[PDB]
Amino acid sequence: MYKWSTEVGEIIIARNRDGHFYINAFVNNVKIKFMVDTGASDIALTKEDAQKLGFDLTKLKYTRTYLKAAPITLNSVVIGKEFKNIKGHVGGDLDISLLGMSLLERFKGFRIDKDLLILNYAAA
Amino acid sequence: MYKWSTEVGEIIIARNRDGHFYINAFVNNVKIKFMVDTGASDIALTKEDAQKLGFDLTKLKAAPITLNSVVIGKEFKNIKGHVGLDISLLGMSLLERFKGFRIDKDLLILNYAAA
Amino acid sequence: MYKWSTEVGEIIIARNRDGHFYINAFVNNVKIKFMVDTGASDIALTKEDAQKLGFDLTKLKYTRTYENKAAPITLNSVVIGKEFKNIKGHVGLGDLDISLLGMSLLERFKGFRIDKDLLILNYAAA
Amino acid sequence: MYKWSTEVGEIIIARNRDGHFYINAFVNNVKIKFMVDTGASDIALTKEDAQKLGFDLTKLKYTRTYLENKAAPITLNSVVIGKEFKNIKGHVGLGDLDISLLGMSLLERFKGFRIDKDLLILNYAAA
């Protein structure tokens, strides 16, 4: 008699009137507010949010570019379920961090249509 | 943010050596053993089993009944059944309520979803 | 190998400005607009909808009561996402503006929920 | 009215009495037989299955080494097991094993993958 089970889930975000989707995540167990960016793939953290996560700004290698930026790795990111070792980077103006496609395509299910962003996931 | 979640489950049971599938449920917290009958619709209890469930035999109408709670993977509410054989029987009326039910060779495969 | 597959689907419907949800469905190959009524049980059709579906109002048996008296019917096919068969209903009062879809049908879906302004339907077929 | 649908599927394999799971696939439209290897990552094709797929043996670069013998990396454009997966990693191995091996890098791509008692269960989702 074989028996198994898991937690399954769905998250829907509706598009704000400025036309973007906003979403909360826990990153290394800190609450971070993200705006979704369809053109990015990588997570773009603000400096402020980098500090909140226990990173040092004077001691970072701002090597790569997208606009100049410091690649980084995030132990865990939770949105529905926990993801691990998530590619990111930290760069200048912007007030809010940005979530790209890479993280979102890691979901079991992920579609945008109409004004809805719909994520499906499974845990254990 | 609209956010939703639930427990999804799967039970897989191997055919018995006698050619049948048997399943052990809790009925109102009481272990019971059912044989699967694909041709049957509602449940068919043995008197023995009827008695284990706090029923009166000689004050009934085969006599139609309702079972408050039947737990196979998840808890099914208010299951149709009756009483008249050796072992009690589980029919299509219960199995169709599962998200999934299929038999394939020596496996009976049951899918369910709770919250 | 034991192989198995099916079609899975999801329908998301936004609430209407008036506060209700509305579903368009094919019933016996005809388009009917329903209002969702989460505390109804079986489908309630308007007379006009009933007539669109070829029911003869003067020959039905008005055998159920509520204080009025209504006529049970069965609908062979109702297609919302997938095709459901032998759906229960009745013809409602002469006053009914729009037909109602209740829980007896909605609970046949694999998934159904309302959250704020979205009604979410999940279904699976062959 | 937002509406969306897709194909979902489950494949189950029972452990043969030798202890191994075996499963067939279409790779670039040819049926290939595999034995599952949880130790492996990549797909390990026999030389015979490579030629059956039209690899030119004598133009492959055998730049890799495994277990001791050499092997040439390849990409399999299309592999169908339930759903189609694209661009699967493999190599073709100078070792003399008679059957090709399917590793975790392909299994892990499934939406659901689990082994318990003697059942390997795979779940997938297409359109």
From TrEMBL, chain C:
UniProt keywords, alphabetically: Acyltransferase, Membrane, Transferase, Transmembrane, Transmembrane helix
Gene Ontology process terms (BP): proteolysis
Listed GO MF terms: acyltransferase activity; aspartic-type endopeptidase activity
This protein's name: Aspartyl protease
Organism field: Rickettsia conorii (strain ATCC VR-613 / Malish 7)
